[PDB]
């Protein structure tokens, strides 16, 4: 997570394959919705966050 | 002194992997900082280091350690604060530490990485000349 914020959306299923440039999550912070974009193809493994949960900067959203 | 057994052979014959971690420490860019504790804790025994005034004038690190059981005082520029510049507060911090070691015969090891003195009218008006001369 690039910043502290609220997980307004989690966009993928546990274990789901993903392509680089798709969206994992959206965080409300800075009075703005910030998308989290997958940086490589892979499988979304152990998706550790729940919608509406608050989280703190640098926490792992998933391994990739 | 603590009892420490000196290993035999040359300085180049006795390099540990922890010593070899120093060869890659310094960033390629002259301006990218690094934590000087990565040097201090590798040249001191057991990595053991008793930092003094850790929260004050963080652009210079001073404190005690041991080298082969001998107590030593470390005085080291810290690139991560003011790029390692000297200032009034660092100069007084290091000057009294050095004079305390010298009273009690503790050898001093200096780790130098200083681009200069910290520029500014606040330093000039507060006496960087008079109080920097303390560390000299």
């Amino acid at each position: 997570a690039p910043m502290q914020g609220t997980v307004v959306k989690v966009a993928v299923e546990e274990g789901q394959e993903v392509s680089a440039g798709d969206l994992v999550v959206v965080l409300e912070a800075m009075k703005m919705e910030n998308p989290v974009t997958a940086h490589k193809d892979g499988t979304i493994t152990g998706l550790a966050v729940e919608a509406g949960a608050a989280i703190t900067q640098g926490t792992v959203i998933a391994e990739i | 002194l603590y009892p420490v057994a000196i290993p035999e052979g040359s300085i180049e014959e006795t390099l540990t992997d922890e010593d070899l971690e120093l060869d890659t420490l310094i960033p390629d860019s002259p301006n990218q900082p690094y934590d000087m504790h990565e040097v201090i804790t590798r040249i001191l025994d057991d990595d053991e280091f008793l930092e003094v005034q850790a929260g004050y004038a963080g652009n210079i690190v001073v404190g005690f350690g041991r080298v082969e059981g001998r107590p030593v005082g470390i005085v080291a520029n810290q690139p991560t604060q003011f790029a390692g510049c000297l200032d009034i507060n660092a100069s007084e911090k290091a000057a009294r530490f050095i004079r305390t070691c010298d009273c009690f015969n503790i050898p001093i090891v200096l780790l130098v990485d200083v681009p200069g003195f910290l520029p500014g009218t606040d330093q000039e008006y507060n006496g960087i000349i008079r109080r920097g001369a303390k560390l000299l």
Partner: protein
């Protein structure tokens, strides 16, 4: 001439300068760089005049490719380990980038905003005489998008004579600020709660203002309305819910809530680096007395 191609924006990237002052008769707020000392330092490092524009990158992550010529760059503010072709170079230092090389900023170890300056400045088209963007009115150059092309202006004849500036490390958590008391400090049952409280910065903070939580401030007369009055960057409003708000660079020209204090010009630029979840402490800059 030289241009940058924006490969990645990071969470937000804005063109900024010293802003558009004096337009309060049009209702236009000054905006400009949130941390003016960092902005101006980056310009001075590249030997720009300080009104030349820079890119304010928020939470880092910005990346661009230099095309069409060599350019001198500097990055100041939040330490993002700025790098060229993946080789880091110092924050608060100049670097010379050759044609075709890639400039990248990581995530900031502390602070919030990094300013990328280029020799000759980011020469997008000015709006109302400034290249700054106002997040509340959206006046100014549009927030940068991937694939944006940024012109590099013609440089002055002066040359960069200093390789780096030493700068004090940005505080990681507790930020301590000097506040001028009032003018409306007499509106409150006990205004020294302002300096007795460890305020916590909420996730709602942005360029318009930073919103705190703490001990509620109590109005002396909670039904009392305020005639709206001029506002400035670093003014500490107290909405009637009792939680303070510190106005940022894009604050509205006039405010509707009592300003209990204003951060001294010595400290206002430190507000430009405080991230959500940091603690804030306030002290009166000189003795508050009614």
């Amino acid at each position: 001439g030289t241009t940058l191609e924006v490969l990645r924006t990071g969470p937000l990237a804005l063109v900024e300068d010293l802003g558009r002052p004096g337009l309060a008769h049009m209702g236009v707020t000054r905006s400009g760089a949130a941390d003016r000392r960092s902005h101006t330092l980056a310009n001075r490092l590249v030997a720009n005049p300080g009104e030349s524009a820079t890119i304010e990158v928020t939470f880092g992550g910005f990346s661009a490719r230099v095309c069409g010529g060599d350019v001198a760059i500097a990055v100041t503010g939040a330490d993002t380990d700025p790098a060229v072709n993946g080789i880091p170079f110092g924050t608060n230092s100049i670097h010379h980038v050759h044609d075709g090389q890639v400039i990248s900023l990581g995530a900031p170890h502390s602070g919030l905003r990094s300013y990328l300056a280029v020799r000759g400045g980011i020469d997008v088209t000015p709006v109302l005489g400034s290249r700054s963007y106002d997040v509340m009115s959206a006046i100014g150059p549009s927030p940068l998008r991937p694939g944006d092309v940024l012109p590099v202006g013609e440089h002055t004849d002066e040359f960069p004579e200093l390789d780096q500036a030493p700068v004090a490390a940005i505080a990681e958590d507790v930020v301590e600020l000097q506040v001028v008391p009032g003018p409306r400090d007499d509106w409150f049952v006990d205004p020294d709660i302002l300096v007795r409280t460890n305020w916590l910065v909420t996730n709602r903070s942005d360029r318009v203002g930073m919103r705190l939580v703490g001990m509620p401030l109590e109005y002396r007369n909670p039904d009392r309305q305020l005639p709206s009055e001029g506002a400035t960057r670093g003014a500490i409003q107290v909405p009637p819910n009792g939680f303070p708000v510190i106005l940022g660079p894009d604050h509205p020209v006039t405010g509707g809530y009592p300003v209990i204090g204003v951060v001294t010009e010595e400290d206002i630029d430190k507000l430009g680096q405080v991230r959500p979840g940091q603690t804030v402490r306030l002290h009166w800059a000189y003795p508050r007395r009614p």
